[PDB]
Short mmCIF file of C-alpha atoms and ligand atoms in Angstrom, two decimals:
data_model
loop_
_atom_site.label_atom_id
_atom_site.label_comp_id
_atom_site.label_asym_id
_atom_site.label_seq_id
_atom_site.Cartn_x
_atom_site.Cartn_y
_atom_site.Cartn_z
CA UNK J 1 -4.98 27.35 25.58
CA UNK J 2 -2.96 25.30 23.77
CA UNK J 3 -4.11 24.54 20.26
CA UNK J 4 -3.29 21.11 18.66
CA UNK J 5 -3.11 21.61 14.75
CA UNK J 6 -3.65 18.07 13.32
CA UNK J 7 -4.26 17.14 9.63
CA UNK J 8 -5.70 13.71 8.34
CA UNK J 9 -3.82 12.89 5.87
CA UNK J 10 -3.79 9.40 3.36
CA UNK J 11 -5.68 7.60 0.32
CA UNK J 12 -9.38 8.45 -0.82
CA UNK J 13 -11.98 6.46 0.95
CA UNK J 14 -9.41 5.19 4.03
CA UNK J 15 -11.94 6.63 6.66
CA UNK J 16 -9.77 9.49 7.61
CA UNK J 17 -13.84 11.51 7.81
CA UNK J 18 -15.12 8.97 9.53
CA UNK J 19 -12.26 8.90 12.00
CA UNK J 20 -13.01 12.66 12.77
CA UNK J 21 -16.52 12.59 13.06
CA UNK J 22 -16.43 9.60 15.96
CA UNK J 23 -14.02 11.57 17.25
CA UNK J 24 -16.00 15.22 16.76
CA UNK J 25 -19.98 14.46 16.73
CA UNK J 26 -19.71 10.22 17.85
CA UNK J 27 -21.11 8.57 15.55
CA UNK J 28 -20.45 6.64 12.21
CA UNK J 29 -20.76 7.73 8.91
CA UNK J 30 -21.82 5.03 6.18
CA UNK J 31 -21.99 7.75 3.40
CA UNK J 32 -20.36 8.43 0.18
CA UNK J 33 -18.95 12.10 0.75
CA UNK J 34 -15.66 12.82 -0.75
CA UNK J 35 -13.99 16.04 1.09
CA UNK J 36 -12.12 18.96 -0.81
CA UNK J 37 -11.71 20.48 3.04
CA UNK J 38 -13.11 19.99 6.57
CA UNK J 39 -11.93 21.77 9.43
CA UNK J 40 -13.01 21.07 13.04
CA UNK J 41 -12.02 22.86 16.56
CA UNK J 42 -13.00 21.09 19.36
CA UNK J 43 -11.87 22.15 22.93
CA UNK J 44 -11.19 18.96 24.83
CA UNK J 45 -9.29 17.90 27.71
CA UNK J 46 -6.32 15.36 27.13
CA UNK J 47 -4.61 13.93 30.04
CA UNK J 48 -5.54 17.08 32.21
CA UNK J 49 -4.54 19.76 30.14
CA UNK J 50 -7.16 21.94 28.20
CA UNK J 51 -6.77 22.70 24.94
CA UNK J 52 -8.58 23.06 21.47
CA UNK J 53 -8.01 20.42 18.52
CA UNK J 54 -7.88 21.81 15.33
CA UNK J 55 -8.24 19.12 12.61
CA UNK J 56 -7.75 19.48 9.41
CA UNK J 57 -9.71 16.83 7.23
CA UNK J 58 -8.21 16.30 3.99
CA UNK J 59 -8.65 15.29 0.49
CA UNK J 60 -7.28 11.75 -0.99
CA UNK J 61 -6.92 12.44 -4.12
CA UNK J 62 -8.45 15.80 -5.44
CA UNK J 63 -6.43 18.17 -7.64
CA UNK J 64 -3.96 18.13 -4.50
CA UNK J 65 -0.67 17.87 -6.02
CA UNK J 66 2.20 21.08 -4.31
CA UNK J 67 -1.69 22.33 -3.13
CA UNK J 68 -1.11 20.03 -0.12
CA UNK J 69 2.06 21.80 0.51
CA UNK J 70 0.49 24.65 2.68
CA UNK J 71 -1.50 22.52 4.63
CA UNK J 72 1.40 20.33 5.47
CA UNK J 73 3.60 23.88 6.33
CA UNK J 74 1.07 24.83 9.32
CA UNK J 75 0.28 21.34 10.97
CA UNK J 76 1.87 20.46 13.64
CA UNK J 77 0.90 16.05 13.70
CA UNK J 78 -0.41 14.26 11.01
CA UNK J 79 -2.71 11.18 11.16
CA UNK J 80 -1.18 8.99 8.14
CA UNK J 81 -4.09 6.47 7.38
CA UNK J 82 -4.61 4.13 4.91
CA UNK J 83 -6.95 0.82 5.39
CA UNK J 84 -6.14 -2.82 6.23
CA UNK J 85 -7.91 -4.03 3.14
CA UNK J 86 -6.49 -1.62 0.67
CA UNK J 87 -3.28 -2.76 -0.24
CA UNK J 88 -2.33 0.24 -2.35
CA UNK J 89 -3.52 2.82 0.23
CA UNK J 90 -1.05 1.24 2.61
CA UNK J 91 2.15 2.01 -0.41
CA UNK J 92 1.01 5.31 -0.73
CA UNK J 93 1.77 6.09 2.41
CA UNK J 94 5.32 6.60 1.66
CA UNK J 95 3.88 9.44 -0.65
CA UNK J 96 2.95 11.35 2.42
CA UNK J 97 5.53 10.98 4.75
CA UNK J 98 7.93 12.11 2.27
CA UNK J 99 6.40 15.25 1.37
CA UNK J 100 5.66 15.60 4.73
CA UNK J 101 9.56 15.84 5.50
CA UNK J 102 10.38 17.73 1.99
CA UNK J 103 7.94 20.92 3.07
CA UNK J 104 8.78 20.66 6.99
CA UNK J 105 12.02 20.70 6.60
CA UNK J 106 12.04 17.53 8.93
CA UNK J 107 13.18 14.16 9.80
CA UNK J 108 11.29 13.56 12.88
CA UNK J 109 7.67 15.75 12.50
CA UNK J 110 4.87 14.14 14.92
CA UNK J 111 3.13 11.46 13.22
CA UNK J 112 1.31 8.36 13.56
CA UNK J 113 0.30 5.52 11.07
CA UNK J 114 -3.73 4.27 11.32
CA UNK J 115 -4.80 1.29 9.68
CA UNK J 116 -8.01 1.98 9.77
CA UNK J 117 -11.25 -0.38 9.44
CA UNK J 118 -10.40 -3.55 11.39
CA UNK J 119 -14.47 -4.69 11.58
CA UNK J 120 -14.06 -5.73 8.28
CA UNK J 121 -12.49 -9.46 8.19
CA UNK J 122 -11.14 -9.54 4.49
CA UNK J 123 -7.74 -8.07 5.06
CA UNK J 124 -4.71 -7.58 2.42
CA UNK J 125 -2.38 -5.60 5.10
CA UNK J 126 -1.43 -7.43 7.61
CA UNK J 127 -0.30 -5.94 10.93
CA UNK J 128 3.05 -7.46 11.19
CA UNK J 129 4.24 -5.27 8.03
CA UNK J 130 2.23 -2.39 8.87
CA UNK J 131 4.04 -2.00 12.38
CA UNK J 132 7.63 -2.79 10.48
CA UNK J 133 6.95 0.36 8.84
CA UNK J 134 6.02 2.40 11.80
CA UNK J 135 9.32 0.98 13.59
CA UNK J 136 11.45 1.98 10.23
CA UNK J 137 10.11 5.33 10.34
CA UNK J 138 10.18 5.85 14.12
CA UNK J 139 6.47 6.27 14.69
CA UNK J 140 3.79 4.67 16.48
CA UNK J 141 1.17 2.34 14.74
CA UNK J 142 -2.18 1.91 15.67
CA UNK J 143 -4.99 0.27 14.06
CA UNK J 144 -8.62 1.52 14.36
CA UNK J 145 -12.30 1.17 13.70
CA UNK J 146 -14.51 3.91 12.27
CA UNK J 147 -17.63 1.64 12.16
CA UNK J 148 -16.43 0.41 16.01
CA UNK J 149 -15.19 3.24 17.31
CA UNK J 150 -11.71 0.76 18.30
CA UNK J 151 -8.95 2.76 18.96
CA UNK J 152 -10.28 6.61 17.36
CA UNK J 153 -8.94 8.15 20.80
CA UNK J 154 -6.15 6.23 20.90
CA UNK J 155 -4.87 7.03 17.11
CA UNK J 156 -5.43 11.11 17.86
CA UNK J 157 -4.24 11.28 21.82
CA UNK J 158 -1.51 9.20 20.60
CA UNK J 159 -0.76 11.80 17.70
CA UNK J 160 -1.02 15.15 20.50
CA UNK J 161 1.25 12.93 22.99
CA UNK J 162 3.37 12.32 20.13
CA UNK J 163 3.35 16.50 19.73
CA UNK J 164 3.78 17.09 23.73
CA UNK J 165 7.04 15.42 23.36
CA UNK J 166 8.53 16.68 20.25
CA UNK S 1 3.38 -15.32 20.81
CA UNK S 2 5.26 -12.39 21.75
CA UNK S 3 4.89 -11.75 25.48
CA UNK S 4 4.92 -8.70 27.13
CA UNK S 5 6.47 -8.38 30.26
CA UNK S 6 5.18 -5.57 32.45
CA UNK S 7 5.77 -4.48 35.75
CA UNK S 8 3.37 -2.15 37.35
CA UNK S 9 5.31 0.22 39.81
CA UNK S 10 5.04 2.92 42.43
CA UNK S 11 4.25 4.23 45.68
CA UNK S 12 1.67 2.13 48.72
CA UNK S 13 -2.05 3.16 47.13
CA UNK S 14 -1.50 4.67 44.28
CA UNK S 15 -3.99 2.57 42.44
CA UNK S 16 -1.70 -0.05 40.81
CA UNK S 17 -3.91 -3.08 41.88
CA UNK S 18 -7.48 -1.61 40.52
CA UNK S 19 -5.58 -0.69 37.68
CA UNK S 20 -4.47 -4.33 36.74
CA UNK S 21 -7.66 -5.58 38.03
CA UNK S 22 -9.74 -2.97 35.51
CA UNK S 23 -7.59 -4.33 32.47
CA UNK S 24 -7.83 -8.06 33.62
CA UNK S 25 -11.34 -8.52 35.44
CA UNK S 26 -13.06 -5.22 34.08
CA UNK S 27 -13.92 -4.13 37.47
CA UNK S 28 -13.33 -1.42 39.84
CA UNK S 29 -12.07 -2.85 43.55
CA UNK S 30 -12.55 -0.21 46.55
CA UNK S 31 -10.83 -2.77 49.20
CA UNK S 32 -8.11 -2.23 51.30
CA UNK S 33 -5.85 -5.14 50.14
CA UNK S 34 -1.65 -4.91 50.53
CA UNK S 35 0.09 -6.43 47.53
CA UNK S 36 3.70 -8.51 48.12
CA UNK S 37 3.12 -9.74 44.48
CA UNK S 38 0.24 -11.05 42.24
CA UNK S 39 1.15 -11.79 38.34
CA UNK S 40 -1.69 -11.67 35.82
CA UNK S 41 -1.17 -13.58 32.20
CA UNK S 42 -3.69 -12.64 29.41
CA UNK S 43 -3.12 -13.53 25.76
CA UNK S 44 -4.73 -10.39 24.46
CA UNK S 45 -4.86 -8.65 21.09
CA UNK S 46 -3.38 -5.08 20.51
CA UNK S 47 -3.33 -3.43 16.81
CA UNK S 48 -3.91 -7.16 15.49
CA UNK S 49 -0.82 -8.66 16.86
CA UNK S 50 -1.62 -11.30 19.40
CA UNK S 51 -0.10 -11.35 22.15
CA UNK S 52 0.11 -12.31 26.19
CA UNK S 53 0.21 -9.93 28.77
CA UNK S 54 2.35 -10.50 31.58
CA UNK S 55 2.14 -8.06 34.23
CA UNK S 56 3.53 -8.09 37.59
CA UNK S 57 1.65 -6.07 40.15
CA UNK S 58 4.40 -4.78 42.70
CA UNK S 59 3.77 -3.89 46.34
CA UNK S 60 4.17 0.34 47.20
CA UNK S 61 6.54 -0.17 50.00
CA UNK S 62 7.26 -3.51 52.02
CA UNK S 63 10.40 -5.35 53.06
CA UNK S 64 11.04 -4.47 49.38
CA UNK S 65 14.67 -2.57 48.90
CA UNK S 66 17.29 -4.51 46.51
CA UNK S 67 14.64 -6.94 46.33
CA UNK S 68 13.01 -5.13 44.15
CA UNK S 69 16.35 -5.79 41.19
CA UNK S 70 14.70 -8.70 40.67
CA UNK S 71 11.95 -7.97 38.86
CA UNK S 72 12.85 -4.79 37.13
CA UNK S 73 15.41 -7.11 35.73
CA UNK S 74 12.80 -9.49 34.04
CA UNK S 75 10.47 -6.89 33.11
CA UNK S 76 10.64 -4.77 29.36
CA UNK S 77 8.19 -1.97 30.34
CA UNK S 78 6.92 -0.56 33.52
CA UNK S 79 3.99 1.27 34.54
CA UNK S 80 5.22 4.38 36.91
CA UNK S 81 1.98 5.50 38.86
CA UNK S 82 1.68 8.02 41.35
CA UNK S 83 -1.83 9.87 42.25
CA UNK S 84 -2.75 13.31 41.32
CA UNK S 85 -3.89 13.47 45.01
CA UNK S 86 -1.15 12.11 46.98
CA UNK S 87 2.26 14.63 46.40
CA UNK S 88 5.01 12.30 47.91
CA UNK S 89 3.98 9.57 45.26
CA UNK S 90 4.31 11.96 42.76
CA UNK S 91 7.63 12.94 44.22
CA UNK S 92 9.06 8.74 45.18
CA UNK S 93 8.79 8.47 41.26
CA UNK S 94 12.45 9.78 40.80
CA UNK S 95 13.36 6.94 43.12
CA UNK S 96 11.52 4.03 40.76
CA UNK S 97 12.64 5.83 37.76
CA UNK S 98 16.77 5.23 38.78
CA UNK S 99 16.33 2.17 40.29
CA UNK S 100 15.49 0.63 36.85
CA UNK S 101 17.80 2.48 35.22
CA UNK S 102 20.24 1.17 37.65
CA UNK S 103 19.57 -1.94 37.68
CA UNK S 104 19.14 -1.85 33.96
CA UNK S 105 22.41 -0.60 32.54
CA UNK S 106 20.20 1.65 30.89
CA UNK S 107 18.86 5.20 30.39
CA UNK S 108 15.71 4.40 27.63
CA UNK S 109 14.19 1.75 29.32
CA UNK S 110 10.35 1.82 27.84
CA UNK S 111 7.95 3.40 30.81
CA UNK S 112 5.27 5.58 31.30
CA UNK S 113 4.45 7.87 33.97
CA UNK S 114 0.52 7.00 35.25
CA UNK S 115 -1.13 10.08 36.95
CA UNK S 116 -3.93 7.64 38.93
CA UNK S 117 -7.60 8.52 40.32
CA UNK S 118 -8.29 11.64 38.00
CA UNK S 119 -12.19 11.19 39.11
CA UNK S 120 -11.41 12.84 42.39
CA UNK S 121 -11.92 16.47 42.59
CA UNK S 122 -9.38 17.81 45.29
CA UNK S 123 -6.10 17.31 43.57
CA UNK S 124 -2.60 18.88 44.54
CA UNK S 125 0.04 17.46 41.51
CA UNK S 126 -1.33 19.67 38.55
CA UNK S 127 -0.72 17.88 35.37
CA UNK S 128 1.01 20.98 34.03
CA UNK S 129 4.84 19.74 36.47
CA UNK S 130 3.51 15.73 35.68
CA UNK S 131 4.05 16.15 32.21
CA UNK S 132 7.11 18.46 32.13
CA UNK S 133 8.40 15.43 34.58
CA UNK S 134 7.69 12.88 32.31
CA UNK S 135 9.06 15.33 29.03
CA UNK S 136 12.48 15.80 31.21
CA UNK S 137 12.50 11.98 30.92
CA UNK S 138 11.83 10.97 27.35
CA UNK S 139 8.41 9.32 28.43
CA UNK S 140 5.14 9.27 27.61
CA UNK S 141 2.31 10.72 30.46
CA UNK S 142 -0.92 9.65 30.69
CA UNK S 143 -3.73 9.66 33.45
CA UNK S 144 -6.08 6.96 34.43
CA UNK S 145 -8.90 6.32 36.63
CA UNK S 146 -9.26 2.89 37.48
CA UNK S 147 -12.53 4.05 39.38
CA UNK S 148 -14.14 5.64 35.89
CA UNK S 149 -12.15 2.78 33.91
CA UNK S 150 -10.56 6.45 32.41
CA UNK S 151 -7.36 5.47 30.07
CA UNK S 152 -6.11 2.43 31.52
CA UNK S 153 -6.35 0.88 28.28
CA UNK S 154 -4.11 3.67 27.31
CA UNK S 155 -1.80 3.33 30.10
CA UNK S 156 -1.16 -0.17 29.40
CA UNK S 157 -1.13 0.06 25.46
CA UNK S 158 1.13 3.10 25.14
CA UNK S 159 3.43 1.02 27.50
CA UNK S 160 3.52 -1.88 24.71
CA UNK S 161 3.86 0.37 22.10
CA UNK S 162 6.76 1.96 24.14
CA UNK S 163 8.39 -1.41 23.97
CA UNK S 164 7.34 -2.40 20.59
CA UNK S 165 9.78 1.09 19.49
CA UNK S 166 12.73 0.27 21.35
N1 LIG Q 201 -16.23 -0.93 7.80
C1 LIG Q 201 -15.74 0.32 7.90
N2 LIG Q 201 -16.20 1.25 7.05
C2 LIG Q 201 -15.62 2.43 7.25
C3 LIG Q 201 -14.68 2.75 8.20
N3 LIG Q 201 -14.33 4.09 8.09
C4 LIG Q 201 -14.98 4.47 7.04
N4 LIG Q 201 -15.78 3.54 6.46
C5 LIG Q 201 -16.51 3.65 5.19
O1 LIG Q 201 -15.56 3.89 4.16
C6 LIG Q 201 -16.14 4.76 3.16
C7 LIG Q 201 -15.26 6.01 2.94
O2 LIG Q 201 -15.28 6.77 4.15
P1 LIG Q 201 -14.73 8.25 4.36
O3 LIG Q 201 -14.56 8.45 5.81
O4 LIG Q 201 -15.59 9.12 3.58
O5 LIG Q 201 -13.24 8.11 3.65
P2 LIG Q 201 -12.20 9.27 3.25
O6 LIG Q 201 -10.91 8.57 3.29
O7 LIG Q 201 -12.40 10.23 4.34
N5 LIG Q 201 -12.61 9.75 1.74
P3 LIG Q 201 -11.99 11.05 0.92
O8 LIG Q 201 -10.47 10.73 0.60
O9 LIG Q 201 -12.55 11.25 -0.43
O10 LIG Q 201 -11.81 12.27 1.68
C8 LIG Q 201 -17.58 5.10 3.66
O11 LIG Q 201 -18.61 4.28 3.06
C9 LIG Q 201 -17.41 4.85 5.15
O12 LIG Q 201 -18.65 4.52 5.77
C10 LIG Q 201 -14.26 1.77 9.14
O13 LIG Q 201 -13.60 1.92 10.15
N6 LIG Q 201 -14.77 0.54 8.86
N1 LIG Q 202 -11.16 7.24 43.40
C1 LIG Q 202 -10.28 6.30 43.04
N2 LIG Q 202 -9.98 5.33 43.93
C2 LIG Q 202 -9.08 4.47 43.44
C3 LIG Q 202 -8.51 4.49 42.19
N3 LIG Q 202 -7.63 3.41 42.06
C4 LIG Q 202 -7.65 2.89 43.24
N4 LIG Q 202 -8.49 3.46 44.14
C5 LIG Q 202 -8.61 3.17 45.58
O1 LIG Q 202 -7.34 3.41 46.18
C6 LIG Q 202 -7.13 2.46 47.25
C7 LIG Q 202 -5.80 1.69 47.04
O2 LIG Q 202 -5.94 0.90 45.86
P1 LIG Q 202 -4.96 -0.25 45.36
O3 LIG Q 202 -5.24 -0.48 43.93
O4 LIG Q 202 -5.05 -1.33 46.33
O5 LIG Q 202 -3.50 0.54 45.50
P2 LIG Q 202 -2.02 -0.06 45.41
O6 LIG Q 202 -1.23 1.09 44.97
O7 LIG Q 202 -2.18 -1.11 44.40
N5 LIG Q 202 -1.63 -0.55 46.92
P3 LIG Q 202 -0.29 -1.42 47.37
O8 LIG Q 202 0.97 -0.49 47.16
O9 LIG Q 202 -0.20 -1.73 48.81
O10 LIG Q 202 0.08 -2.52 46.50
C8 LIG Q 202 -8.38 1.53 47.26
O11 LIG Q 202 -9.37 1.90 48.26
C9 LIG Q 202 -8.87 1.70 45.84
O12 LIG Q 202 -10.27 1.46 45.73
C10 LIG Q 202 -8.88 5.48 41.25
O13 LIG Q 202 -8.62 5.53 40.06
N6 LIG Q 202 -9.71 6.41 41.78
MG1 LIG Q 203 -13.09 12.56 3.60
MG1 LIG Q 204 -1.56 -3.45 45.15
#
């Protein structure tokens, strides 16, 4: 079937985790866990077609410096996520989608920008500047809730629609 | 606010009604009930911007011809549904799709192609030739069950997204 190689990708502590497990096992996460590597194959069925996600869940800060560079090469989409009340996670977002487009060779590569955690009512980012970067880049934006489960299936069947049309 | 104005098109029972009436009244309809023209309003919130929905729910065949100009003039986005059950709707969508680039001057004019009632068991458009249809256009595909309430949020919020890009 067709395989869908995703990797999370953005700041420690955004929720990229607990964005894959509601999407994976459904259900939130309120844990401290900080990930070196997750991986998780699911076969699913998006908009009729069968076919297996492979996610890669990723570290945010970690020793990954060039060591990202291989996990960028074999991913297809990324899910760029940072947090609406983390201001720096959303300016290091630019650190990704750069690197991104230095190891892929790429100025369009399938990719979508989550603010994640939009329970949470003290916000720094708002979404008028968060979807002005998603229209400079040309990418979709979508906001989401780990906590809520708002808009998890929406940020990764965006991302695979995003892939179908590439 | 910003407005969004929608028109929700294609062939006589596709499912356009009880897909409007799922998004505005959360409820599935099973009537038999013609639409000329019904317009729903709903200020509504989608990735924290706030906005109102304006959609214009469009009748499948009627006295409708060049009266139809109208409205794909007014509208940003349109919905194009067929069902994966019915294959001339599948097959009219070439003559929506034209028609609003016609009257349009245009060739991207933000749309999605809807594959409705994806609940139903005994279907004859495979979503394999649906979503090389909608990659020959530049569009987005996505199907919806307005029985099973399946994606019409994601119908209608791809579609704003679509229009939020342009
Ligand atoms: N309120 C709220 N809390 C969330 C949300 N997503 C994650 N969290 C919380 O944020 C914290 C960090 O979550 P986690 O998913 O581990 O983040 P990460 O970005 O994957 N961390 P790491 O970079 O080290 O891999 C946890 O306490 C988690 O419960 C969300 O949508 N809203
Ligand atoms: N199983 C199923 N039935 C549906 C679905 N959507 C609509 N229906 C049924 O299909 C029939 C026609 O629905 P309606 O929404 O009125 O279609 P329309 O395309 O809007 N008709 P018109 O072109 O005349 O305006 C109704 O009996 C309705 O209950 C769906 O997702 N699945
Ligand atoms: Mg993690
Ligand atoms: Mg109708």
């Amino acid at each position: 079937m067709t395989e869908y190689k995703l990797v999370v990708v953005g700041a420690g502590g955004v929720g990229k985790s607990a964005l894959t497990i509601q999407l994976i096992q459904n259900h939130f996460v309120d844990e401290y866990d900080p990930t070196i590597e997750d991986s998780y194959r699911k076969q699913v069925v998006i908009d009729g077609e069968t076919c297996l996600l492979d996610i890669l869940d990723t570290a945010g800060h970690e020793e990954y410096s060039a060591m990202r560079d291989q996990y960028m090469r074999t991913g297809e989409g990324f899910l760029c996520v940072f947090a609406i009340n983390n201001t720096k996670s959303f300016e290091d977002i630019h650190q990704y989608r750069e690197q991104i487009k230095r190891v892929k060779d790429s100025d369009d590569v399938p990719m979508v920008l989550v603010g994640n955690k939009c329970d949470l009512a003290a916000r720094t980012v708002e979404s008028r500047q968060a979807q002005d970067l998603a229209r400079s880049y040309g990418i979709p934006y979508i906001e989401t809730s780990a906590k809520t489960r708002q808009g998890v299936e929406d940020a990764f069947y965006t991302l695979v629609r995003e892939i179908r049309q590439h």
